[PDB]
With several copies, the nearest count.
Chain A
Amino acid sequence: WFRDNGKHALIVYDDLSKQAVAYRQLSLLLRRPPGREAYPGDVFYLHSRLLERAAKLSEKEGSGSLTALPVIETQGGDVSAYIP
C-alpha cells in the first residue's frame, strides 16, 4: 500500500522459518504430496511470491519502494537445508 502510493516502506519478515513449517503443516494436513524435508514443493513458490512484493518501483509509480529483511532461524548454522 505504501509502495504503490509513492511512499517508502520497510518489511522485516521475522522468523520465516516457522512460516515455512506452518505452511508445511497446512500442506501435510491437506493431503498435499510431501517434498524435500517433508516441506511441500510450493514453499519456494510461497516465498518467491512473498519476497517479490517488496521491490523498488520506477518513478512512474511514485518511486515508492518496499524493503524486505527476512530472517531464517536455522539450527546449527546449517543453511544447506532445503528451506534456507
Chain B
Amino acid sequence: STPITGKVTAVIGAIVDVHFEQSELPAILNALEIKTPQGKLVLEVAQHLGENTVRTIAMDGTEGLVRGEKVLDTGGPISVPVGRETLGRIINVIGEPIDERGPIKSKLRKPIHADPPSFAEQSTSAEILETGIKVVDLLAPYARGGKIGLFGGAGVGKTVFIQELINNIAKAHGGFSVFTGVGERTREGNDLYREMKETGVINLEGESKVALVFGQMNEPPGARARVALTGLTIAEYFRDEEGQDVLLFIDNIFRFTQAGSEVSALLGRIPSAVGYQPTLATDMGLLQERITTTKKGSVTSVQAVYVPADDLTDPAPATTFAHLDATTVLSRGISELGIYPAVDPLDSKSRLLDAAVVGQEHYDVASKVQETLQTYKSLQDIIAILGMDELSEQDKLTVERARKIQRFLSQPFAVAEVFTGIPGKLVRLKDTVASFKAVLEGKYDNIPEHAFYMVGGIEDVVAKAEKLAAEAN
C-alpha cells in the first residue's frame, strides 16, 4: 500500500486541519495518527473542507502541534484492540491501554465505526435474560438487546450493583461485560477501578470479567464522543466472537449527548436558542443501532444515568423511560430499611414485563407482587398513623405477605464478600419465580420474617428458618 501522509494546516483548538494529496484523502470517521513526544495522538475526520484538506477532531490534547507535521493515515476508523486480552484493562478512546499494565496483546483491531445491521436483521423477539438477582430479573426483567438502565443516587450501592451484575452475567450467562467512561470524573473513575480490583472479579493474574474501557473527559469532546463507540466495538466483538449475552454499561447518556453537542458546535453546527438539543439525532441513533440482538449473541446496554437533582435538562436524559425497556432505580429509602439491593420494586418497571414476553406465570407473579407491595405501603401509612390495630385480617394477610416479599428482596452479592462479608449467591430465574410465587400464596407464612431477610431462594429461606429455630428459638 502507498504511504498515505498529510501536512497539518490549521489547529482549531481541538480541531486540526490536515492537507493531503490527490486520492490520498481519507474518508470521514477515519483515524489519522500523528507522532508526538507525549505518546501517540490520532484524529478522526468529520468534515471535508476541500482543496485536499480534511477537518479532523483530536482524541487528545493538541499540545506542541506544528504546521507541516506529518499525519499518517491508518486506513479506516479508529481501530481498537479487541479480545479477551482487553478484559480488566483500562483502554482509552484511541486504544492504547492507559492502565500502566503494558501493551494489549490483542490479535484483532475492529474499527469503531462498523456498519450497523439492517432493518430486516433487527430481531423484534423479546426474551428476558436471567441476571442472578431475583428483584431485577422478576420485578423489572432486563430486555435482551434493548436499552435498560440504572437510576440511583450516591451511597446507595450503584457501583456494587454494577459489580454484581457483571459478575452474575460472567457466571450465569458465561458472558463478559464492558463499562464505558464517557464524561467521567477521574476521582470516581479511580474509586471504581479500585473497587473493581478489590472485589476480586478482575483477577489481574487470572480471569477478568469486565473490559473496562475508560476515557477521561479532560480530553477534547471527540474523545468523549468516541469512547462510547470503542466500548460498543469491544462489546460487539465479544458478542460476535463468543456465544455470550454480554451486557454493556454506559455510565451516562447525558455526558455522551453533551459531548456530541459540543462536537457539533465545534464542527459548525448549532442548537436552538434558550436551550434545546436536537442535534444528537445522528449520533444517538447510531449508538442505539449499535446495540441490537444478533443471531449468535447480544448486547444489553445499561444506562446508569445518575439523577441530576430530580431535574433532567437535556432532551435525551429528559424522560429516559421512552428509551428504557427495564427501569432499575436505586432509591435510598429501600437501602435505609437495610435491604442490600437498592432496587425499588414499585418504581422499577419494565416494558417487557408482559404475559406474551416473559411468560404467563412470570407476569402473574410480578403483577401480584407489585399489587401486594402497593397495598403494603398503602396500609403502612395507616399502620404508622392509626396503629397496627386499625387493620383487617385480609389486610393483615396482604401486609405480611408483602413484607415477606420485601424482606426476601434482600439477597447476597458475590462481589460484596469483602465489602461486608456475605456469602454471595446466584439465583435462578425459574427458582426466583418458584420462590416468589411460593411466598405469594402464603404457604410460607409460618416461616419467621427474619428468615426471609438476607437470603436468596426458598431453599435458603427454609434453611435460615430452621437455623433460627435451632440456634435462637
Interface 1/0s, chain A 30-73, versus B by CB < 8 A? 00111110001110110011001001100000000000000000
B265 pairs with A40, CB closer than 8 A: yes
Secondary structure call for the A interface:
loop
**CB-CB < 8 A to A40: which residues of B?**
13, 265-266
A80 pairs with B313, CB closer than 8 A: yes
* Chain B: minimal CB distance from A36 (Å): 6
* Chain A: minimal CB distance from B215 (Å): 12
Q: A34-B270, A36-B261, A36-B271 are in contact. Are A42 and B187 (CB under 8 A)?
A: no
**CB-CB < 8 A to B219: which residues of A?**
45, 48
B186 pairs with A80, CB closer than 8 A: no
Interface size class of A (residues with CB under 8 A): 10 to 19
Contact partner of A41 (CB less than 8 A), chosen from B61, B218, B221, B311, is B221
Which residues of chain A in 1-44 are interfacial with respect to chain B, using CB atoms and an 8 Å cutoff? 27, 32-36, 40-42, 44
Interface size class of B (residues with CB under 8 A): 20 to 34
Interface 1/0s, chain B 248-277, versus A by CB < 8 A? 000000000010011111111011000100
**CB-CB < 8 A to A33: which residues of B?**
265-268, 270
**CB-CB < 8 A to B262: which residues of A?**
35-36, 41-42, 44-45
**CB-CB < 8 A to B218: which residues of A?**
45, 48-49, 52
Instruction: Count chain B CB atoms within 10 A of each CB in A32, A45, A56, A81 and give the residue with the most.
Output: A45
Docked CA distance A82–B272 (Å): 13
Q: Does B382 contact A (CB under 8 A)?
A: no
Q: A32-B13, A48-B217, A52-B216 are in contact. Are A42 and B266 (CB under 8 A)?
A: yes
* Chain B: minimal CB distance from A14 (Å): 21
Contact partner of B220 (CB less than 8 A), chosen from A35, A45, A52, A56, is A45
Q: A44-B221, A52-B218, A80-B313 are in contact. Are A34 and B186 (CB under 8 A)?
A: no
* Chain A: minimal CB distance from B347 (Å): 25
**CB-CB < 8 A to A55: which residues of B?**
186-187
Q: A55-B186, A82-B275 are in contact. Are A45 and B221 (CB under 8 A)?
A: yes
Q: Does B356 contact A (CB under 8 A)?
A: no
Docked CA distance A4–B265 (Å): 36
B221 pairs with A35, CB closer than 8 A: no
Q: A32-B12, A36-B271, A80-B313 are in contact. Are A41 and B266 (CB under 8 A)?
A: yes
* Chain A: minimal CB distance from B341 (Å): 30
* Chain A: minimal CB distance from B38 (Å): 14
**CB-CB < 8 A to A80: which residues of B?**
275, 311, 313
* Chain B: minimal CB distance from A25 (Å): 15
Q: Which residue of A lies closest to B313 (CB)?
A: A80
**CB-CB < 8 A to B258: which residues of A?**
44
* Chain A: minimal CB distance from B13 (Å): 5
Q: Does B343 contact A (CB under 8 A)?
A: no
Q: A32-B13, A33-B266, A55-B186 are in contact. Are A42 and B261 (CB under 8 A)?
A: no
**CB-CB < 8 A to A49: which residues of B?**
61, 218
**CB-CB < 8 A to A52: which residues of B?**
186, 216, 218
Interface 1/0s, chain B 215-235, versus A by CB < 8 A? 011111100000000000000
Which residues of chain B in 181-228 are interfacial with respect to chain A, using CB atoms and an 8 Å cutoff? 186-187, 216-221
A42 pairs with B275, CB closer than 8 A: no
Instruction: Count chain A CB atoms within 10 A of each CB in B14, B217, B265, B313 and give the residue with the most.
Output: B265
Docked CA distance A44–B262 (Å): 8
Q: Which residue of B lies closest to A81 (CB)?
A: B275
**CB-CB < 8 A to A36: which residues of B?**
261-262, 265, 271, 275
Q: Which residue of A lies closest to B277 (CB)?
A: A36
Q: A42-B14, A52-B186, A80-B275 are in contact. Are A35 and B217 (CB under 8 A)?
A: no
* Chain B: minimal CB distance from A6 (Å): 19
**CB-CB < 8 A to A42: which residues of B?**
13-14, 220-221, 262, 266
Q: Which residue of B lies closest to A44 (CB)?
A: B262
Which A residues contact B (CB, under 8 angstroms)? 27, 32-36, 40-42, 44-45, 48-49, 52, 55-56, 80-82
Query: Which 6 pairs between the two chains have the least Cβ-Cβ distance?
Result: A41-B262, A35-B265, A41-B265, A52-B218, A48-B218, A41-B266
CB<8 Å pairs between A and B, sample of 17: A33-B266, A33-B267, A35-B262, A35-B271, A36-B262, A40-B265, A41-B264, A41-B266, A42-B266, A45-B13, A45-B14, A45-B218, A45-B220, A45-B221, A48-B216, A49-B61, A56-B187
User: Told that A35-B270, A36-B271, A45-B218 touch, could you supply 5 new A-B pairs with CB distance under 8 A?
Assistant: A35-B271, A41-B262, A41-B265, A45-B262, A52-B186
